């Protein structure tokens, strides 16, 4: 039934047919009597005599598939011995076809080939250097990939084998050199695949080569004589080494050379007019390099990648080669994602640089700066926004005079991200001109790519402006209603046409968050019906926009939206169970938003969601096990369901009973939900090798414990899951967790974040358990104290900050105050980082406040350090370390000094300390530190202490600012867009209503004494009465 | 990881 295909292969007069049958014959080898030997020989003659290689290869592959099958038992024992013979033949063409046939056998993966590893090692050790056929040398390198996989299959790596295999690696490098010299780009790529497979190998096979392979790929990548496609192979290889063997790169300190190599390739000339008008190649060297810098920034420490880029920013930005100006800007835009914190600290350099880019004559440079700004905004959202007064005029001017479509898109996109995060009070100055400009722009531009960018920017105005968007609400929906007609009719629409509708659905729902239910009522019903139309549509992008609309609806209507659950939850369920492979990115994005919608619905529906809890947790749990890209988000939504249940049971955030629970402060039904998700959370952290998975779980557990207490991790006196959680978290601190193991080493920002989120488990358990935390804290304490000594500035900062917060959780029930206080004083006194000393001073005051032993010996040294730290922040104030840090250091130092005066007034000489305190008041940030200062003011004035009594005018002025700031906060609280309450606690001036009343009561007393000084101030006269 | 600091319109 099968032999037919072979005969066509031998005989067909037309030559292509011989080949076409060979392709089919190989496929049909497995299914398909005494003369199986006659068919073997006919193939071998054809495979060494046929004229043209393609037919030769066609014959050879059929032979190999036969050999693997005819190796159930010893059915063809001479095949491998004959091929080994022919590969040593004097005729180079005979050797070439022999190695080709051996390669096909190796491609069969027949388990019996492992019987021959030493044969292959000996043969390929010779044929790899064959001086007659470069093709034969390349096939031998290709063959070596399979031989290595065989030696690793063995129980124990044969040491003799791996020494032979590693000895061959320089030979493969010699082949790579040869193929590049002869221009055989087909084989150059194949050798690059061989180099890529070495990355995955066990270190015993590769020797110490991997670092030198990287060095060599960089030599190839930077050399512009080499063909473009070959250089891409080299950039990709180094990018591949960052993923699979960054430990080797670190050992060679290759990060900076990689960064600089990628920087030089990125500066090469590109097609300017294509960049400017062609709406999105990453197979040209300069673009591939940007992927290299991006991956380098994610995998390595900012000292290895970010610092080299910033050191070259001044010379490249002023270069007369616009492509060097363009490069450094795009280098920054790709650095920000993996090194956000490092990038933020360089804003004193980067913000002016982006401004210079916007001012450039060359549009390619202007486009780069805008891409940089976009990237910065996405990543460090409000930080970029604060510089709007410089940006907005510059970006508007570019929009007004743009000559290319891609500059217009990125200028609108840059405006979108800036406005999205501008403070509510600052947007008010601009809101009317922006609004009229955006709608003037929406009218002019008919390209759906440009209209989508404008609609998003308009939605960002509403988001920032909150209630201040009401005057524009009706006219905006009137206009935008046109882009959401015929939602169901998705045929005859382009991809950009789909996106313009989807963005309109999403940003109209953002307007409901800005102007709330009352001003949204006019259009609620038609818009919700259209959103359901989108959910049923065959466009995943369109369904995704529908779920986004509903999620924001949940925020607007709360329980009032509950009658819609019965229809919507089944549409969400269908979305979450979709098959995820075409991967179909639209479905991944749709699944993410549907999951957000399901979480938002659960929170809002309250009691009405209970009948959906079990089913929702069933669907979500399945996605954690089987979904390819939704595990973290799916697990997060389970915890959101838990939050919905616990709030429905009227467990109020932060109102849980402290200490290890002997039983449960939650009813049996809610406890069963918690235990379910608590079980899945531990299962996805234990022996988990995805660090993003471990981070996500630790974040969810931290947030849930802070909100609802130890019942999240423990109940009924059983601490099995608590011990597991700390066992895992302690592993991450030691650097010994599975996600880590694939001591002083320099760490990436992701690696450091992993450290911080594990510390956050301890910080949250200490507030949960108070004195009951001491037992659990005993193992981590030595590790964390050791981390306070790291060569890493962020690690020292994380540990000291976490020790300070742990102190706050344990309060006076902490049996280690003396030991912790001693460590933090060393940090306060000797650390070279202002940020580290900043966090240290907070813990020092807390520890002193909670100490019950004699601290008279440490007051004087600590106070001297506290005045010196006021000295290093003073100089910095006048002209690594940001202004935010400096201002926080003043707040924390003053809080620490106040806590000490409060604790042991007799030990502190007030005549000099009170003015130092006053001179740094009012605060600019860290208003939590007012709490001890208000308390100190209360006590000093109650004792009619002379030092404060003479300072009444400064004290009155401080409270004028405090109450002025407090009312501004209350106005912002009511007018803001729904759900932007990220920093609600941080802008609070008072830590409690009780202390706020004491300050008011103190202010009234101050009015009688000092004869109405208090009421002279309009702010305080209002609060006094 | 302590006092010094370490979602939006989109979904």
Automatic annotation (TrEMBL), chain A:
Location of the protein in the cell: Cytoplasm; Nucleus
InterPro entries cross-referenced by the UniProt entry: ARM-like (IPR011989), ARM-type_fold (IPR016024), HEAT_type_2 (IPR021133), IMB1_TNPO1-like_TPR (IPR058584), Importin-beta_N (IPR001494), Importin_beta (IPR040122), TOG (IPR034085), TPR_IPO4/5 (IPR057672)
Importin N-terminal domain mapped to chain residues: 1-49
GO biological process, one term: protein import into nucleus
Pfam families: IBN_N, TPR_IMB1, TPR_IPO5
Ranges of the HEAT repeats in the UniProt entry: 350-388
Main localisation: cytoplasm
GO molecular function, one term: small GTPase binding
Keywords: Cytoplasm, Nucleus, Protein transport, Repeat, Transport
GO cellular component: cytoplasm; nucleus
Protein name: KLLA0E20769p
Record organism: Kluyveromyces lactis (strain ATCC 8585 / CBS 2359 / DSM 70799 / NBRC 1267 / NRRL Y-1140 / WM37) (Yeast)
Lineage per the UniProt record: Eukaryota, Fungi, Dikarya, Ascomycota, Saccharomycotina
